[PDB]
Amino acid sequence: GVWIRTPPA
Amino acid sequence: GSHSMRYFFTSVSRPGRGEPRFIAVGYVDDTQFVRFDSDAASQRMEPRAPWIEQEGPEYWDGETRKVKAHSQTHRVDLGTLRGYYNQSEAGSHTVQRMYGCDVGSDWRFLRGYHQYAYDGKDYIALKEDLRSWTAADMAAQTTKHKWEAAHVAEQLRAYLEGTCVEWLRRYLENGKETLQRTDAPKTHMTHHAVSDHEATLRCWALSFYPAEITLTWQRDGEDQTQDTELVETRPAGDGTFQKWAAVVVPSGQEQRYTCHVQHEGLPKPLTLRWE
Amino acid sequence: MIQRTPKIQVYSRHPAENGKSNFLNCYVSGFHPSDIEVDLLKNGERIEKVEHSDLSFSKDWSFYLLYYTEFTPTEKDEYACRVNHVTLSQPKIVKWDRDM
Predict the structure, then answer these.
(1) B-contacting residues of C 55-84, CB under 8 Å?
(2) Distance from CA of A3 to the nearest CA of B (A)
(3) By residue range, what is the domain housing residue C54?
(4) Which residues form the Ig-like C1-type domain (chain C)?
(5) C28 vs C5: CA distance, rounded Å
(6) Which uninterrupted H or E stretch holds B244?
(7) Strand pairing of B3-12 and B94-103?
(8) Structural domain tally of chain B?
């Protein structure tokens, strides 16, 4: 299962 | 042996042609088990292994929601990084992200990782201790400061050391019939005449899993890298892999050369010799 | 901007035997950027029913793709893989060699 969400760069 | 779960995310901008291409793939060891492709019909995370298909609708809805969020972040990032480097709107650019976790033979957490690239080279990466970042240049330092302010490392560490490994263990159990298998390489050797006085010896490994393998040539028992060629390990398409290693030798001296094959499925390494 | 030339391998899933069903593979690896043309050719003409893997990449960020088609090799039929990429001055055609 993937990470919940990714932060913008 | 050890096991891994890894996710790979690629976004590619399309100047003058709309939204970026986005492709996500998930692997357990050398076995793909999910994908998302912006080009495809469903716009959902999709199964690519029978042992993941069995997960229920809440799993697939959740993975779809989260992977769409990944896609959105990449779409913003392409614009942001274009800004950081003051690049024009004329060119296509690439964002790549890889993250995941390794467990040992005891299935206990071994290590975690998260790497991020812009246009094919390192941009920013989590350090091994999962507590700080390595940035490639000043532009990437901007991102580093943002992720420090947002305490991304803390959250990500919680995922890599916990959730990631929990998923990996679940998958390893459910897909045990294929994931916890070892397929030993089938080996053989061929010969070509290069000229009247030179010959190519080619050492073959076929039908093996996992992909990790070592093929080495030796002359009189000493390692030889000179006049050798190693092709990239390649998928057969049936879940197994192939590789070969060749050496150019003086005609008549074939017997001095031995190919050595190391694989998980070979407790005793193999030594092949030309007839 | 990283530009990496594709490494191209053309081979069969199983040991080739004329008259027996098999899969013809074209594996392209180690390339960047991701935009790439890959076609399988039978006697100089492109094969339509070709599948391809989901774009993924290696530790050095370079991409890899597998294109494959079901086929029955014969003594007469010539197979090849045509690849085009920004790193190539012209399209590269790699013939199927049964020992490569």
Answers:
(1) 55-57, 61-63, 66, 68
(2) 7
(3) 1-100
(4) 6-94
(5) 10
(6) strand B241-250
(7) antiparallel
(8) 2
